[PDB]
Amino acid sequence: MQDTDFFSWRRTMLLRFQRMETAEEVYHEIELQAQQLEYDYYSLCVRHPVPFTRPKVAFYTNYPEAWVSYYQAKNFLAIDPVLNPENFSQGHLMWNDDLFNEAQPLWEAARAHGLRRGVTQYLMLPNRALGFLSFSRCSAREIPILSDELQLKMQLLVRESLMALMRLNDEIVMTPEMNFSKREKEILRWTAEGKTSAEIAMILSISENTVNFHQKNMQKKINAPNKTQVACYAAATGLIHHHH
Amino acid sequence: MQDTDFFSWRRTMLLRFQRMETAEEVYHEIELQAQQLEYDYYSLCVRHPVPFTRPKVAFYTNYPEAWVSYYQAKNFLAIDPVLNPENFSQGHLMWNDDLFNEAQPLWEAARAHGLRRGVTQYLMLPNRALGFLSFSRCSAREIPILSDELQLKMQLLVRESLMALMRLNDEIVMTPEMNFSKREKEILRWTAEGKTSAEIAMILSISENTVNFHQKNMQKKINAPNKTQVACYAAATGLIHHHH
Numbered sequence: 067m068q069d070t071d072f073f074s075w076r077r078t079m080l081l082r083f084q085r086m087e088t089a090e091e092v093y094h095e096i097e098l099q100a101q102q103l104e105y106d107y108y109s110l111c112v113r114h115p116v117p118f119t120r121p122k123v124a125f126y127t128n129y130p131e132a133w134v135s136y137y138q139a140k141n142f143l144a145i146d147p148v149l150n151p152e153n154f155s156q157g158h159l160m161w162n163d164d165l166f167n168e169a170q171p172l173w174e175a176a177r178a179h180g181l182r183r184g185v186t187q188y189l190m191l192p193n194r195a196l197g198f199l200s201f202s203r204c205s206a207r208e209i210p211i212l213s214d215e216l217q218l219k220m221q222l223l224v225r226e227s228l229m230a231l232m233r234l235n236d237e238i239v240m241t242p243e244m245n246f247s248k249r250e251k252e253i254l255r256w257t258a259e260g261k262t263s264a265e266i267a268m269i270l271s272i273s274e275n276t277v278n279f280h281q282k283n284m285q286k287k288i289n290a291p292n293k294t295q296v297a298c299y300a301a302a303t304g305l306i307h308h309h310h
Numbered sequence: 311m312q313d314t315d316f317f318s319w320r321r322t323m324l325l326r327f328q329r330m331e332t333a334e335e336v337y338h339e340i341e342l343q344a345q346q347l348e349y350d351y352y353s354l355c356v357r358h359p360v361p362f363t364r365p366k367v368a369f370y371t372n373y374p375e376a377w378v379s380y381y382q383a384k385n386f387l388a389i390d391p392v393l394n395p396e397n398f399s400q401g402h403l404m405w406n407d408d409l410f411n412e413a414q415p416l417w418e419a420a421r422a423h424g425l426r427r428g429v430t431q432y433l434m435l436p437n438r439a440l441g442f443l444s445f446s447r448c449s450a451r452e453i454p455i456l457s458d459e460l461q462l463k464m465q466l467l468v469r470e471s472l473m474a475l476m477r478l479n480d481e482i483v484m485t486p487e488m489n490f491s492k493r494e495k496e497i498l499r500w501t502a503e504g505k506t507s508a509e510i511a512m513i514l515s516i517s518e519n520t521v522n523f524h525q526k527n528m529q530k531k532i533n534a535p536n537k538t539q540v541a542c543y544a545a546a547t548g549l550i551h552h553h554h
């Protein structure tokens with residue numbers, strides 16, 4: 067089946083995001099597209115895969131500054147439904163009351179700051195980071211628009227905006243950098259396979275001290291105590307394989 | 311912008327994939343949808359994140375059996391363009407001749423087995439596995455269809471088919487299982503942060519031998535030599551966090 071005005075909307079937005087230049091342009095276009103769907107505020111959170119124990123959650127938003135501060139103050143992240151992929155279908159999640167039954171103080175606090183309606187689309191990025199694009203309005207008024215239309219528009223928006231920010235190396239999306247050589251990564255592959263410094267020397271046909279140097283060298287770059295952190299981080303973000 | 315016959319195609323296919331029951335039903339529906347787009351053969355490959363050194367590549371296809379055997383014989387995977395995410399735009403990749411300049415023997419071998427035209431859509435799964443859905447026909451004939459239509463149809467097909475196979479725990483998509491408890495995973499979080507068995511005991515307020523047991527216990531389950539493999543695998547597949 068085919069029927070094209072959305073197909074043209076798609077084409078136009080792909081080009082527009084590709085021809086951007088600044089992270090400020092990105093934020094601005096989201097702010098625009100949200101208003102095009104009659105949403106007042108937007109929001110773009112990014113759950114990083116690392117650190118494992120205290121996951122970095124970078125974000126930028128045009129929310130009321132008072133709300134951003136309050137949300138952080140009472141740490142609602144720990145209970146926020148819309149930042150929990152389990153609640154999503156097709157990477158889409160509509161805001162309703164029943165969704166916040168376990169996080170009631172967040173639900174009331176958000177209303178007290180003018181966030182009465184909303185919606186969130188999400189996507190996992192090549193660096194295994196979870197990107198969440200949330201729209202919100204202060205009007206409980208009914209804005210009728212086809213559900214299928216909304217999903218696909220946001221499906222594209224959340225993707226191309228974060229893909230842009232990655233091409234621009236923005237701090238919001240960029241995982242901790244680890245500029246490793248091809249040999250360094252080769253050594254780290256086997257390290258994650260559980261191979262010892264001794265065994266890796268045999269495979270690569272090099273001195274056992276040469277392996278230990280590379281290992282300590284990588285640790286130094288990213289400031290890590292042992293090879294376990296280096297390898298786990300490298301595996302957690304897909305450096306051992308896939309994209310860069 | 312909105313215009314709905316595709317939106318209805320979307321809705322219909324979402325339900326159909328959700329109400330499935332067997333991995334044979336999935337394969338069959340792809341085979342069907344490929345023929346609906348005038349493609350003779352399909353193919354569904356899945357690059358696993360682990361093992362790191364010899365990445366498992368499971369697949370199932372209705373290709374000529376002779377071709378599947380030949381492709382494996384001369385190991386064309388190592389040079390196959392259509393299974394390399396770097397060549398993709400919007401997770402979509404059209405087959406053309408210039409794409410195979412570095413893999414000429416594959417290009418000729420594939421033609422010798424009746425694969426003259428094709429296309430591939432790809433997607434990364436929650437377990438960090440890369441799923442590749444390829445369609446191919448034996449007719450060099452021109453089948454005119456809107457590019458934008460093809461992309462979005464396949465964008466949905468590759469997703470919902472692999473998401474189905476995961477709900478069914480199929481061997482093609484399922485990463486190596488590691489049924490770990492909440493405490494076991496808690497210990498493994500810190501292990502990947504580079505924390506020693508001694509330090510982890512201090513944080514969790516438990517014996518240092520208790521930590522070592524959990525560690526050896528996890529190793530036993532997945533048959534691993536040391537904690538480094540357990541943690542790296544657990545991080546590589548997103549067990550320490552995100553989905554299950």
Ligand SMILES: CCCCCCCC(=O)OC[C@@H](O)CO
Pocket residue numbers: 109110111125127129133134137146147148172173176181200
């Ligand atoms: C956490 C980013 C700054 C605070 C904005 C909250 C991010 C987000 O979109 O949350 C919306 C819902 O939680 C509403 O309850």
Ligand SMILES: CCCCCCCC(=O)OC[C@@H](O)CO
Pocket residue numbers: 353354355369371373377378381390391392416417420425444
């Ligand atoms: C590798 C799965 C079995 C062999 C089929 C090849 C998988 C795939 O779709 O490859 C197509 C292109 O490489 C054509 O040159």
